């Protein structure tokens, strides 16, 4: 019922449309300009599960590492990318980077609490 998010965001519109959209299932922690040890440390400090990193052909090479950097530290870690669904090549390239799924910014509600669902019950709870 409750989790922390992190948000790697390239405009504010990107992380209102999160934190709005994922109200009831938790809190949408922004990581605004951070390097892969400050974005580890930032994870762990809210014992997030999922990061949500918006990736577009001006930052997919910077960012594309910081996903591949995230997911060898973290493998557990359910890495959302945020861009254009019409590009084949983008969606490609965030999978192999190591995301999990890939949602564009302006998507109904719905379909963020559905993602989240679907993640939540991936993985067993008791450790």
């Not at 922390?4 to 709005?20: R, S």
């Not at 400050?38 to 990061?51: I, K, R, S």
């Amino acid at each position: 019922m409750n989790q922390n998010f992190v948000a790697l965001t390239q405009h504010p519109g990107e992380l209102d449309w999160l934190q709005n959209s994922l109200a009831s299932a938790g809190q949408v922690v922004p990581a605004g300009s951070a390097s892969l040890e400050e974005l580890l440390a930032l994870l762990d400090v809210t014992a997030a599960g999922v990061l949500f990193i918006s990736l577009g052909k001006s930052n997919l090479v910077s960012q594309g590492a910081l996903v591949e950097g995230l997911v060898s530290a973290r493998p557990m870690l359910s890495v959302v990318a945020i861009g254009d669904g019409l590009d084949n090549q983008l969606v490609l390239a965030a999978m192999r980077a190591g995301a999990r799924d890939f949602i564009t910014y302006g998507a109904r509600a719905s379909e963020l609490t559905g993602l989240i669902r679907r993640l939540g019950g991936r993985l067993p709870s008791v450790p």
